[PDB]
Every structure is written in C-alpha cells, then in structure tokens.
Design a protein around this nucleic acid. Structure first.
Lengths: 98, 59, 53, 68, 131, 71, 162
RNA sequence: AGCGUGUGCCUACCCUACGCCGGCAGGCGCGGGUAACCCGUUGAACCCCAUUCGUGAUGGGGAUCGGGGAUUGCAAUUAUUCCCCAUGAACGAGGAAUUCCCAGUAAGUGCGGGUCAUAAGCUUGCGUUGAUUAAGUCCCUGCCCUUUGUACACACCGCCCG
RNA sequence: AGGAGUGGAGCCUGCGGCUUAAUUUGACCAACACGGGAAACCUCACCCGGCCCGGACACGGACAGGAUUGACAGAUUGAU
C-alpha cells in the first residue's frame, strides 16, 4: 500500500456504474466528498486511474483543475472479469440517443 | 460593476490600465390577479436569455 | 509513515488559491473572482463582460 | 489628590511595585537605569542602544547619516 | 545566577513581590502583574506542547549536582515567556544554524527566549564598491 | 537549485527483521491448545490476535494509540 | 435548497459556467469541427446546444459520446440529477465560422503539409462561402530556428471603431 | 456632498443601527440588511462663527525615545496594528539643475474601491472649495512634408586621419 | 507668459553599493511606490536541519512458517 484493498473496489465499482469518473487536483482532501463516500482520505481516485490509464482501458481529459476519465470498451471487458460480473451487463448506459 | 486592473502582465513599459464594465438592469411589473393564470402565461413566450422571478406577495 | 503533513492554513495568502493551476502571487478576491488577472483579460470576449469603455 | 492612575507617566515602573510620577532630575536617573538593565540581561534592546542604532522597527538603510 | 538585589533584598522586588511568592503562585495571580502582552499568551494558549520543554528543564535541574548548572536543553522555539520556575536552567536556542546557549536569570522574566540570541552578524563595513 | 552535497549518514527505512513465524501456540498434547499470554481485550479487537509478551510493557500492536498496560 | 445568492453574483457564476464549458468542449471536439455552444436554462430543464459542423462524429454509434458528455456535467457542477439535457446542432454556412476554420487549418498543418498551399486552400473557401474579406497569420518558426510571420489576405477588413 | 460597498462567498468569513459598561482603544446584550427596501434623509473635511496664544525654534514642527493599556492570530521578539501619559530633534523657505499643467482646469480638502485574519504615507475612482496666466511661436527639445549634399546603410552612438 | 513644486530638512518606500551562514530574483525616454511585490507563518523561488514518495507501467527476482504494513514505552530528537 499505495492504498488498501477495500478502497480499490469502491473506485472500480463506482466507475462501472456511471461509466465515467471526475475529480479535482488536491492532496489535502480529507475524506473525498462528492461521491466515493467518505473512505478515500488521499489521492486514491487519481492514483488508481493513472495506473489503469497506463495500461489503456480509459481516456483522460483535464481542464480547469478537474480530471475527466472516460471508460472504454477494453476496460469494460477487464472490469467485468476482474469484478466477476455477468457476461452482459453494463449499468452505466445502454440506449439509443435521439 | 467596475473592474480597474493592469493591461500589462509582468509590469514593464508605460503604466496602463483598462476599465471594464457590466451594466445590469432591473425592472418589475406588479399585477394583482389569480396566481394560476399568471404562472401559466408568464413562463412561456420568452425568446431571449432573460430571467424572471415570480413572487407570492409583497403588498 | 508520518503523523503530520500540514500545519494551519486558515487565513493569509496561502489558504486561498487562484484557478490557473493553484497559482498565487496575484492576490485576488474581487466580487467572487478566484480568477487570475492574466486570464481575465483572455475572457474579456467571453461572457461576464464585453468591453464598451 | 485623585488624579487617575492611567494619567501618570509610570504605572508599575517595573521592580518597584507602584504607580509613580517622575519629575525633572529623577526622570533622567530612572531612564539611565532602564538602559543599563537591558544591557545587564543583554537583550536585543541594550545591544541596539550601545551600538547607537534604532531600537524600534525602522529601516536604517536610508535613515541616518551624520557620514556619506 | 550569581546576582543580588535584582528580585529580593534592598533594591528591587519584582513588582512588589519576591521571586519566592511567584513560585507558589499559579499563572492566574502572576499574569495580573502588569505586562500586557504576556496575558494574551497564557489566557489564549494554555500549553500547545510546550510540555516537551518545561519537563526537561525541571528534570535536568533536579538531577544536576548541587552548586553546578545542568547541561543544556535545546530548542528551535524562540517563543515562550521566561518564568521564575525556568530560572537556573541553561538553554540553547536555534538561530538559523547555531544554538547559542544562555543562562536564565531571575531578571529576564517576562521577556522571550529569542531576545537573548541574535540571528545576524552586527555588521561591518566596508569600502564602497564600484557602482 | 544546485545539486545536493554529500551527507555522512543517510539511511532510509529499517528492514523490519525477518523473524520466524508462528510459535505463539504451544502443543504438548492434543486436543489441548496451550496458549501463552492473553489475547487482546477490546471490542474493536477480534480477540483472535495475541498481545505482546513484552514484560515491563504489555501492548496490543493492533491498537496504535491506546491500551498499553505495563506491569 | 436555498436561499439564493445576490443578483450581482448571479451573473458572475453564470459567466463562469458559460466559459469553463466552452474550453472543456474545445479540448475534445477539436477534430469534430467544434464551433461553439449556446446554453439555455428552460422550465425545470437545462439545454446545452453543442454546435458543431459534423454531428456524425459527435453522436457516435448508439449515442455513446453524447451519453458520456451528459454524465460528466451531471457530476461535475453538481447538477440535480436528470435535469441536464444535451442537444446538438449543425450550422449551415461554415466559412463564417472562424473558430472552426482556424481549428481545421490546425489539423491540416499538424497532419503534415506545407503552409503556403494550406493557407491558400482555407482562404478561398471562407471567401467562397461569403465574406467581404479574410486574413490568416502564421507566426513562429520554419526553415531555420529564427521566427518569421506569414500574412495571407484577400478582400476587405476593418480594424477600428465599434 | 458624491462615486461605491456590504454576511448567506473559499472552506469560515460582512456592513452596522440601537441598549448597557469604560477616559480611550474596546467589551457586552439585542435587531435589520440578497440590498432606490437595512447601515445611510450617507447629520465628511476644507470652509463658516466666537474664545485663547503673540513674532518668540514659541503653545510653530512631531522626529527620536521610556513606561503602561487594548485588538487580530496557532505564534506579534528585530517593537503587526490601535490607544494613554511622558520625552521634544532637524527644520525659520531652500545651490547647480529639473518636473507638470490652459476651465469646474491648476492648487487646497475629504471620501469609496483595490491588497486585507490584523494594517496605506501606495494606486484607482469620486465629490467639495476653486485662482493667476496665454489665445502665441519655432528660440531651445522633438516630430511631419518637400528640395539639396553624402566616402553613411551595424545607417553620425555613423564614418574616418596623422 | 505664468501657476504649484521637486532638488534643501525630517520621515515612508523602491534601486545600487557594502555586510551576511542566507541577506532569493526580474527590470536600467521605453527600469527605479514597477512584477497588484504594503514578505510575522503561509507566501517563498533563498539559507540551515528533519521526514515522506505521491518512482506510472513493463520484464525478471522475492513469495503464503509469507512479499509486506503500522505502532506503545525507553533511549534519541526542536519534536508527542
């Protein structure tokens, strides 16, 4: 650690549910409000997404002191097997935009 | 709203400034009638980006 | 690891930060700025202002 | 004669234990003691006094001249 | 300490009371003796881990041989009111690099530690340069 | 700005000695389990962990600011 | 859910939302022929009209990209859930859209192509589409490690007054 | 008298009426203000009216410096700021030089905003009182146009001789 | 043609020089109360001490009597 094994899940599961993450650039955040609820007292979101990004599986924008991580197809496959989920579930979104 | 600030980043050269201004406008029309037909007709028939605030009572 | 990482910042020029990247030096507060004077100029066209005088 | 304590020169001189009012030739004698005291302990004060430099927070870079 | 007539005897008792009374007083009675800036530091503060200093002073003072002063307790803290209980100890006070040691007198009470250790060379000159 | 000048000490992190593991449970006959020192009594402790046999000091390592007996 | 900020501060906070978005989008939709936005709050709903020339690449297959963008704004500015509603728009007459014309020239150049022939090609399009005149500048290096400037101008221009 | 400004903002914070206590700094109890709504009919200074001082480095000037009291802060020492008593210097219209200004203008005089946890001799705006002198010229300094001369074009800060 | 000043005096502040363990630094009509720069800490770039990794990712090694993590007290330490 680098970070606990609980706090990994709570980021990787939350990303899978919205299909997108966002956060701010700070190192004095006390519990990280604004989801992941009160169990990330440090970097952890930024630090775990960066390692994930190194191995592809996500894209990253940055604009006016705010990250924006966009999950991709390759990471959906990874996260699906990594978290032992059904062979066809995406709860992030799935409908045609009109 | 006035903002009077430097025109030069990293001040050098002849000392210059720049006046910016924003002008807001307020005006209000007082009606006395049933609150239904007001709140019906008010929120519709507005083309531009102009704000409206309805009040229950003031007088 | 450590038992400290921080010390009181509650007022002064270090407990507020401006929105360039967390830049400073260029003390700013005005009418709810939190916005850097160099970039304020670049947002003269953008909305908040149009120059008229 | 009921002139208030705050209206005096000295309130609790220091190490004498009372409110006092000091007049002409005793003033100088009292004054010279407090100088001597602050070099006795040798605080920052007495050193600045003995060197002939400003006691209070003041710049001496452009202030003074006697010299030039 | 080797002085006389600076806090007891003929000539000088510390604002009408000897050192001996001060040591038995609480801070409460002591601060009401006129020295305005002191009173802020006590009434607001009330020990923000000055604990580390004040135990070492009493401790070292105790264990040290009679008619001999202790070694030193060192500080980077240049701020703390000199007090009657502190007297007789020897304290080194950090400047920017150097721990200038000082003996504490009963005549220094009320002052800070940092007034008795300087942090610059007094100055010499010079010979004006070129430009 | 300029490059670091030589030290004459620096050492980072201790290697946290490579002790032999679990001899904390003693077996002399079965099914009996001969426990040594008491297992930790707090509600937040699970009481499956041992307390330190550290005599003249008696301390739960699961705790990290509290519960230090010494006799 | 209250109260509510001063009327002076009401306009400043709107301006900050209008501006931040307009640079957020420009760093993602650059290749899709971005050209601006036009925001509108409407009764119990937000509209964010995302103007770009080619709505095709903005939409994506099964509307994935538009879904990403709506979910972002829903978390970032802390909007009440489901209030945000995006819409797209295609502009007609693309040579009066300076912002898009400049950012198209960028990818033509960064694609690896000569400067003179590129500047001419963009020029006649913005002239053809309708325009009194037009201008292009390219300031920086080329053919060595001292900088220069290259102006390409046709038609009318103004520089002074309101 | 005027331009403004004010808590619900950044992360801990506003502007203040009124009552009470204190010489003062200040403390304390209550109430309003999202503001043509409350502070604020902004009951400001110079100015105006009546006493006192008397040509005296004077009661002009307030530098230096001792002691004491408050406020901000996690912390005030090399004095954060503010207040009270005491101390009472240079300075009595300023060389060679030099800056700026043409009508509500110069000058005198106060106020708001900016930075701000505490704090303007600064800067940016605003009111109030309000002159003398000019209605010109190329003398100096400099600039625009033509003509002329040039060994100059790194352009007279140039170039070049013994 | 004139009006009010500056240069003179005391004080504030910026700049040079000198000093210093450090006295951080840009700028020389078109620099010099200028860098919103009125610095207690913060700011902070400087100087002197102490701690931390927030060295991704890849490959190899280590490795479930185990890779590894943290800590009371005592000593040490400005320091809990």
């Amino acid at each position: 650690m680098l970070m606990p094994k609980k706090n990994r899940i709570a980021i990787y599961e939350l990303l899978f549910k919205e299909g997108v993450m966002v956060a701010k650039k700070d190192v004095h955040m006390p519990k990280h409000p604004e989801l992941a609820d009160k169990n990330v007292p440090n970097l952890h979101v930024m630090k775990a997404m960066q390692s994930l990004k190194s191995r592809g599986y996500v894209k990253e924008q940055f604009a006016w002191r705010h990250f924006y991580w966009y999950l991709t197809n390759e990471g959906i496959q990874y996260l699906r097997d990594y978290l032992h989920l059904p062979p066809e579930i995406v709860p992030a979104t799935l409908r045609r935009s009109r | 709203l006035r903002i009077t600030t430097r025109k030069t980043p990293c001040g050098e050269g002849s000392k210059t400034w720049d006046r910016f201004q924003m002008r807001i406008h307020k005006r209000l029309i007082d009606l006395h009638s049933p609150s239904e037909i007001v709140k019906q007709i008010t929120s519709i028939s507005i083309e531009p980006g102009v704000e409206v605030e309805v009040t229950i009572a003031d007088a | 690891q450590q038992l400290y990482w921080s010390h009181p910042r509650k007022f002064g020029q270090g407990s507020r930060s401006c929105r360039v990247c967390s830049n400073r030096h260029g003390l700013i507060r005005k009418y709810g700025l939190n916005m850097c004077r160099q970039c304020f100029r670049q947002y003269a066209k953008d909305i908040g202002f149009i120059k008229l005088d | 004669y009921k002139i208030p304590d705050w209206f005096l020169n000295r309130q609790k001189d220091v190490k004498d234990g009372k409110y006092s009012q000091v007049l002409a030739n005793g003033l100088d004698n009292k004054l010279r003691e407090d100088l001597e005291r602050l070099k006795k302990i040798r605080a920052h004060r007495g050193l600045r006094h003995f060197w002939g430099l400003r006691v209070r927070g003041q710049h001496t870079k452009t202030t003074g001249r006697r010299g030039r | 300490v080797e002085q006389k007539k600076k806090r007891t005897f003929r000539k000088f008792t510390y604002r009408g009371v000897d050192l001996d009374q001060l040591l038995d007083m609480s801070y409460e009675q002591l601060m009401q003796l006129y020295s305005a800036r002191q009173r802020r530091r006590l009434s607001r503060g009330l020990r923000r881990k000055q604990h580390s200093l004040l135990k070492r002073l009493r401790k070292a003072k105790k264990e040290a041989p009679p008619m001999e002063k202790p070694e030193v307790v060192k500080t980077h803290l240049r701020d703390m009111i000199i007090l009657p209980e502190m007297v007789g100890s020897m304290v080194g006070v950090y400047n920017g690099k150097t721990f200038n040691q000082v003996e504490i007198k009963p005549e220094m009470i009320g002052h800070y530690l940092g007034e008795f250790s300087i942090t610059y060379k007094p100055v010499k000159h010079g010979r004006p340069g070129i430009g | 700005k300029k490059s670091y000048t030589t030290p004459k000490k620096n050492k980072h992190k201790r290697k946290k000695v490579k002790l032999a593991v679990l001899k904390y449970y003693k077996v002399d006959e079965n099914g009996k389990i001969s426990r040594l020192r008491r297992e930790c009594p707090s509600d937040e402790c699970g009481a499956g962990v041992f307390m330190a046999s550290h005599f003249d000091r008696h301390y739960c390592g699961k705790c990290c600011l509290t519960y230090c007996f010494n006799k | 859910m209250a109260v509510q900020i001063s009327k002076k501060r009401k306009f400043v906070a709107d301006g900050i939302f209008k501006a931040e978005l307009n640079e957020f989008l420009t760093r993602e939709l650059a290749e899709d022929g971005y050209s601006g936005v036009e925001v509108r709050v409407t009764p119990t709903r937000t509209e964010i009209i995302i103007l770009a020339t080619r709505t095709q690449n903005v939409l994506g297959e099964k509307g994935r990209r538009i879904r990403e963008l709506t979910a972002v704004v829903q978390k970032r500015f802390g909007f009440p859930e489901g209030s945000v509603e995006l819409y797209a728009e295609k502009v007609a007459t693309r040579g009066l859209c300076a912002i898009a014309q400049a950012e198209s020239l960028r990818y033509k150049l960064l694609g690896g192509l000569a400067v003179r022939r590129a500047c001419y090609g963009v020029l006649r399009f913005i002239m053809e589409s309708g325009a009194k005149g037009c201008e292009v500048v390219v300031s920086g290096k080329l053919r060595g490690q001292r900088a220069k400037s290259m102006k390409f101008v046709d038609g009318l221009m103004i520089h002074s007054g309101d």
